[PDB]
Amino acid sequence: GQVQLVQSGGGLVQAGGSLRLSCAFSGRTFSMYTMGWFRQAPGKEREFVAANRGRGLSPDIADSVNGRFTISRDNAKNTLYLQMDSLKPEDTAVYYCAADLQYGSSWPQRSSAEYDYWGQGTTVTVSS
């Protein structure tokens, strides 16, 4: 078995608006993966945003987006979402989803070097 993550969504959006990003999972046993979102703004390093390890467990959300961004997974469609509300220009970045096999890893998991599969990235720009 392989894992493949396919991202959809993204665009140019005005501050205070709202977007939802999608990350489709392809492979076996969605539920054995921690799923996460990372972002990389121009110039800076990859930054942790949010992660989810399964339906009935609390997410791990970065301080910078707590109260604005929410993460959820759809088990029916094997899809990870990132709902971005109250967008700010500082949210401008390329957004990546990633998967971490839970066996042999740990929770919470904010280190990008510990994730094992990555989506292709989604560009989100927030204008004033």
Residue numbers in the entry: 1 to 128
What does the paper say about this structure?
In this work, we describe the expression, purification, crystallization and structural analysis of the variable fragment of an antibody BCD090-M2, which demonstrated an affinity to the extracellular domain of ErbB3 in preliminary experiments. In conclusion, here were present expression and purification, functional and structural analysis of a new single-domain llama antibody against human ErbB3. The phage display selection of antibodies from immunized llamas and subsequent sequencing allowed the identification of several anti-ErbB3 single-chain antibodies.
The protein was successfully crystallized in two different forms: in space group C2 with a single copy of BCD090-M2 in the asymmetric unit and in P1 with two molecules and two cadmium ions in the unit cell. Surprisingly, the CDR H2 existed in multiple distant conformations in different crystal forms, while the more complex CDR H3 had a low structural variability.
